[PDB]
Amino acid sequence: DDKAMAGNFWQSSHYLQWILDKQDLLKERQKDLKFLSEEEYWKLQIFFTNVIQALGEHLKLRQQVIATATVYFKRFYARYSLKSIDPVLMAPTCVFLASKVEEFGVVSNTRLIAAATSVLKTRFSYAFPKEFPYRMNHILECEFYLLELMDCCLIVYHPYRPLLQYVQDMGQEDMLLPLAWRIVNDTYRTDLCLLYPPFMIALACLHVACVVQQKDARQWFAELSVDMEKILEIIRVILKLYEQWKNFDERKEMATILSKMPKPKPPP
Amino acid sequence: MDYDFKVKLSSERERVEDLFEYEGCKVGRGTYGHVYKAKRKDGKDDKDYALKQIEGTGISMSACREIALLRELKHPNVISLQKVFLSHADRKVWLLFDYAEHDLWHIIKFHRQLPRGMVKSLLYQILDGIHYLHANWVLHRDLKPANILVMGEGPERGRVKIADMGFVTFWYRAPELLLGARHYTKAIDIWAIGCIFAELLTSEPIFHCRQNPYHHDQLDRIFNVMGFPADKDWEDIKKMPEHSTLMKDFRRNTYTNCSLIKYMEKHKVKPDSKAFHLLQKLLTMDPIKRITSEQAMQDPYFLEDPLPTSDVFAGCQIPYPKREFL
Numbered sequence: 001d002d003k004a005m006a007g008n009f010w011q012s013s014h015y016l017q018w019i020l021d022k023q024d025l026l027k028e029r030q031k032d033l034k035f036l037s038e039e040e041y042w043k044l045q046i047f048f049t050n051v052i053q054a055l056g057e058h059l060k061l062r063q064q065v066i067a068t069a070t071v072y073f074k075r076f077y078a079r080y081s082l083k084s085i086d087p088v089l090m091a092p093t094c095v096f097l098a099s100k101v102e103e104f105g106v107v108s109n110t111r112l113i114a115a116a117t118s119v120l121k122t123r124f125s126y127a128f129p130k131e132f133p134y135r136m137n138h139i140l141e142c143e144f145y146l147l148e149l150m151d152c153c154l155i156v157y158h159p160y161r162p163l164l165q166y167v168q169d170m171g172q173e174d175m176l177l178p179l180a181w182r183i184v185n186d187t188y189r190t191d192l193c194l195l196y197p198p199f200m201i202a203l204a205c206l207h208v209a210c211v212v213q214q215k216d217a218r219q220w221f222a223e224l225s226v227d228m229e230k231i232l233e234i235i236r237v238i239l240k241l242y243e244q245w246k247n248f249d250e251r252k253e254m255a256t257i258l259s260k261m262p263k264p265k266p267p268p
Numbered sequence: 269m270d271y272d273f274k275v276k277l278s279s280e281r282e283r284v285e286d287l288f289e290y291e292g293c294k295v296g297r298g299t300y301g302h303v304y305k306a307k308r309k310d311g312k313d314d315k316d317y318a319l320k321q322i323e324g325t326g327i328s329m330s331a332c333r334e335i336a337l338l339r340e341l342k343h344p345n346v347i348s349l350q351k352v353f354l355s356h357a358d359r360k361v362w363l364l365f366d367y368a369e370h371d372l373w374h375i376i377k378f379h380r381q382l383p384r385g386m387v388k389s390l391l392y393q394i395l396d397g398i399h400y401l402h403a404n405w406v407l408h409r410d411l412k413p414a415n416i417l418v419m420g421e422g423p424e425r426g427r428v429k430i431a432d433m434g435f436v437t438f439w440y441r442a443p444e445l446l447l448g449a450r451h452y453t454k455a456i457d458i459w460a461i462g463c464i465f466a467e468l469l470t471s472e473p474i475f476h477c478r479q480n481p482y483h484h485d486q487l488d489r490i491f492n493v494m495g496f497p498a499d500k501d502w503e504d505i506k507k508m509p510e511h512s513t514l515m516k517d518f519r520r521n522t523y524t525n526c527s528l529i530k531y532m533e534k535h536k537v538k539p540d541s542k543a544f545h546l547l548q549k550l551l552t553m554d555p556i557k558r559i560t561s562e563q564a565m566q567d568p569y570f571l572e573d574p575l576p577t578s579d580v581f582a583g584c585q586i587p588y589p590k591r592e593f594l
């Protein structure tokens with residue numbers, strides 16, 4: 001058995017439309033950088049990446065659904081501003097839609113909202129004093145805006161499948177996989193998934209996993225056939241994020257940072 | 269939400285009513301929704317389009333599944349999604365497909381015999397299309413003459429397009445599903461293609477039957493045509509959930525006279541023809557003894573004169589009635 005469109009990545013809508021050029025991404029970001037510093041924008045990305053992981057965990061969705069919900073979120077705000085739709089509303093909308101795409105079903109109108117409300121209250125009260133203000137009609141409306149901006153591109157490929165295939169090939173699943181898998185999770189704190197094919201991210205995470213546990217895989221890697229200059233770019237971003245992580249007190253800074261986000265203009 | 273955002277997207281968004289003329293032109297009323305023959309009002313197109321309003325409102329499993337899959341799929345023989353309209357006013361979803369004037373149900377209906385160049389052509393493009401979906405682990409799950417669309421006059425003259433319209437016919441259902449197998453497989457699709465091929469050869473549904481997954485009479489007809497499987501023909505028939513029930517209700521000696529050769533001889537098809545030999549590898553009772561779509565495409569039936577034509581009609585005049593509105 002196997003999953004639908006598993007080996008179609010190179011003719012996929014992910015590849016053909018949603019691997020963006022970095023310069024275009026940072027250009028459209030300059031809208032929100034008049035209200036936030038470079039540092040503060042990436043801290044938000046991490047924060048809402050944690051919001052999405054917690055929601056997915058409360059709902060008991062598998063890791064593949066959480067990653068798809070995250071990529072939708074990134075896709076949206078890669079193109080449009082933080083003022084456009086409240087990211088408090090977008091995050092549970094991304095999990096909702098992703099859960100329908102990965103074939104786990106419609107989350108109940110009661111369950112999705114109780115999920116949103118309980119997770120912001122319990123795990124995120126430091127950034128959110130007030131209870132979750134949105135109801136299911138706001139979710140349904142947002143979902144409609146989400147599907148439009150993505151040009152109905154729903155199938156998302158991730159690094160977890162090729163990561164398992166490489167580590168099987170190494171013969172080291174017990175030794176290297178648990179850690180490499182965890183580094184893949186962490187990459188979602190960054191723009192990587194909009195800039196590199198998922199297999200290349202996989203290799204980079206596998207490489208950091210090898211350095212960490214001191215396993216020599218010099219020749220295995222050189223025996224592969226890929227632009228290593230690209231894999232080195234990714235490895236640099238992964239190493240970078242672990243220094244960002246270290247210096248960032250999500251809990252002691254996010255309420256101030258959230259207050260600086262641009263405001264959704266209301267009707268007159 | 270930001271107000272400038274709402275109004276800008278609102279202004280710019282393409283609407284179904286604005287760009288397409290479809291009122292009165294309802295061609296099908298399926299279980300997944302209603303299908304319309306749609307003319308493009310805005311200038312540059314005399315080409316017609318099939319427009320589908322997905323039943324229900326919002327993004328149901330059905331809606332999300334169809335959008336997601338067909339937005340990725342790209343093959344000449346699988347039907348192609350041209351555009352999605354999301355209508356905010358009433359939360360209805362519209363899908364735009366290439367309009368297909370014909371289908372194998374109406375073609376087979378009309379001949380109540382088909383030329384053999386046409387049969388072979390039709391079969392090869394079904395195999396081609398199904399192979400693509402199967403390579404992508406996309407199972408059809410309900411192949412039959414009405415889901416095999418054929419493109420009428422224009423740039424894709426005679427090209428088969430595989431679809432899924434939606435909606436009692438267990439005539440195309442493999443025997444493992446009648447004995448209660450849980451999952452759909454690639455082999456289940458191929459059985460149904462064998463049924464379609466026999467029907468193209470003879471114009472009669474091979475396993476035609478009068479109106480739980482178990483169905484006694486559908487099984488009887490299969491056995492009347494194909495004869496009762498011997499243990500050695502299907503060793504894991506014993507593993508099937510309804511095998512006890514099968515052994516209760518049926519006796520193999522009832523079907524001693526019955527075989528595929530004898531059915532197909534009776535309808536003027538020779539049992540030493542390449543046509544017949546490929547049909548038997550398609551209509552094999554045991555799924556694991558059923559050849560793949562790739563293998564059928566390699567069969568020397570498609571090398572024997574006449575070759576598959578790209579145009580199923582091979583230049584000739586299309587004598588089939590066009591689609592009536594509803």
Ligand SMILES: Cc1ccc(-n2nc(C(C)(C)C)cc2NC(=O)NCCO)cc1
Nearest residue numbers: 320330333334346347408430431432433
């Ligand atoms: C819920 C749902 C309904 C139909 C489809 N579907 N699937 C296919 C295959 C043959 C490529 C697998 C084609 C379609 N849909 C259609 O062909 N729709 C046109 C009129 O309904 C998918 C999902």
